[PDB]
Design a protein around this motif. Structure first.
Motif, PDB file in Angstrom:
ATOM      1  N   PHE A 291      -6.560  56.158  78.174  1.00 46.20           N
ATOM      2  CA  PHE A 291      -6.721  55.331  76.949  1.00 46.20           C
ATOM      3  C   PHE A 291      -5.591  55.658  75.971  1.00 46.20           C
ATOM      4  N   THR A 292      -4.765  54.677  75.599  1.00 47.24           N
ATOM      5  CA  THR A 292      -3.737  54.883  74.551  1.00 47.24           C
ATOM      6  C   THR A 292      -4.411  54.838  73.183  1.00 47.24           C
ATOM      7  N   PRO A 293      -3.785  55.407  72.134  1.00 49.25           N
ATOM      8  CA  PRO A 293      -4.296  55.239  70.773  1.00 49.25           C
ATOM      9  C   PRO A 293      -4.577  53.764  70.427  1.00 49.25           C
ATOM     10  N   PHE A 294      -3.689  52.855  70.838  1.00 49.67           N
ATOM     11  CA  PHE A 294      -3.816  51.393  70.590  1.00 49.67           C
ATOM     12  C   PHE A 294      -5.077  50.870  71.296  1.00 49.67           C
ATOM     13  N   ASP A 295      -5.311  51.293  72.545  1.00 51.90           N
ATOM     14  CA  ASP A 295      -6.507  50.933  73.360  1.00 51.90           C
ATOM     15  C   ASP A 295      -7.792  51.341  72.630  1.00 51.90           C
ATOM     16  N   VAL A 296      -7.831  52.560  72.087  1.00 52.56           N
ATOM     17  CA  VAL A 296      -9.028  53.086  71.383  1.00 52.56           C
ATOM     18  C   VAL A 296      -9.271  52.235  70.133  1.00 52.56           C
ATOM     19  N   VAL A 297      -8.238  51.986  69.337  1.00 50.45           N
ATOM     20  CA  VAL A 297      -8.370  51.175  68.093  1.00 50.45           C
ATOM     21  C   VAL A 297      -8.908  49.786  68.483  1.00 50.45           C
ATOM     22  N   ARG A 298      -8.350  49.192  69.539  1.00 54.54           N
ATOM     23  CA  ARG A 298      -8.706  47.820  69.992  1.00 54.54           C
ATOM     24  C   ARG A 298     -10.191  47.780  70.358  1.00 54.54           C
TER      25      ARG A 298
END
Length: 305
Positions: A291-298
């Motif tokens: 999970f990328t930081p962007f994936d978690v925020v999304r």
């Protein structure tokens, strides 16, 4: 709440998948506008793959030797060219379902969705990461070549991966859509081994933030650390070094939870040295790094396409 390994909706990409046959070889192609992209090894016999000269093999091929089928209907091939490790087949029909799209080359640590296809027909969709050793841990059977990896930004599909080969260790290698392999891999049946599969530290920290947001908090401790002290311990466990740039990227998740990045690093340090002691985080007994930081925020804010 809840946190799942979530793929992008596949509809836009399902509309671009075709079957490509050259002699006895069938695999998958990507039909965008009036071009079909596929792995150049479509032209190879089993014997050819031991030591292929692609330019020499291609001389023996004409347009009519490339059979392209889009859901039971035959497409007419009016041109072919090789770009690096992909074939570009020009067809006489633009794909009417072509989405807004881009070709990107992703960095290690970045995630994407794979639409696994056989005979130009979607089988399934799943999320992957580009590993630090430029392999992916996919799920690909014989026939899967030409399956693509992608990200969606609202209505625009960014294609980043085309599947070409499996290493005997069960991991996967492929190209961007300009036909350049990720990492040192080549489309030849010769001894190739993956390097060290290091853990994507910034992604583990993103996933720990995900755990806190979703109420999984037992691993939070009273400690902090420094980048340099964390990296001494990380390196020991084959974790990628964490940089100030990574700290900046975790800013939004830090702000959402009110837990400083270096405090979360101190929690991760304790999990690495102590282990899980038979406990779980977001249903995992391992530290998840895809999970990328962007994936978690999304996923934690409900972004749609």
């Amino acid at each position: 709440s809840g946190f799942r390994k979530m793929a992008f909706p596949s509809g836009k990409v399902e509309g671009c998948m075709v079957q490509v046959t050259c002699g006895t070889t069938t695999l998958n192609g990507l039909w965008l506008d009036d071009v079909v992209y596929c792995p150049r090894h479509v032209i190879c016999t089993s014997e050819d793959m031991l030591n292929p000269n692609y330019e020499d093999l291609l001389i023996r091929k004409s347009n009519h030797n490339f059979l392209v089928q889009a859901g039971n209907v035959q497409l007419r091939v009016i041109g072919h060219s090789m770009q690096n490790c992909v074939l570009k087949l020009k067809v006489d029909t633009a794909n009417p379902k072509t989405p807004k799209y881009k070709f990107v080359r992703i960095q290690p640590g970045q995630t994407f969705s794979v639409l696994a296809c056989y005979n130009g027909s979607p089988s399934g969709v799943y999320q992957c990461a580009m590993r630090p050793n430029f392999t992916i841990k996919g799920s690909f059977l014989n026939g899967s070549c030409g399956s693509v990896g992608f990200n969606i930004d609202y209505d625009c599909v960014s294609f980043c991966y085309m599947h070409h080969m499996e290493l005997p260790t069960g991991v996967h290698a492929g190209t961007d859509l300009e036909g350049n392999f990720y990492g040192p891999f080549v489309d030849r049946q010769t001894a190739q081994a993956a390097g060290t599969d290091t853990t994507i530290t910034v992604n583990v920290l993103a996933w720990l933030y995900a755990a806190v947001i979703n109420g999984d908090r037992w691993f939070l401790n009273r400690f902090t650390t420094t980048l340099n002290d964390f990296n001494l311990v990380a390196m020991k466990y084959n974790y990628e070094p964490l940089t100030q740039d990574h700290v900046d990227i975790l800013g939004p998740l830090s702000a959402q939870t009110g837990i400083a990045v270096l405090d979360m690093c101190a929690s991760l340090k304790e999990l690495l040295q102590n282990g899980m002691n038979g406990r779980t985080i977001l249903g995992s007994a391992l530290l998840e790094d895809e999970f990328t930081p962007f994936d978690v925020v999304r996923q934690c804010s409900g972004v749609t396409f």
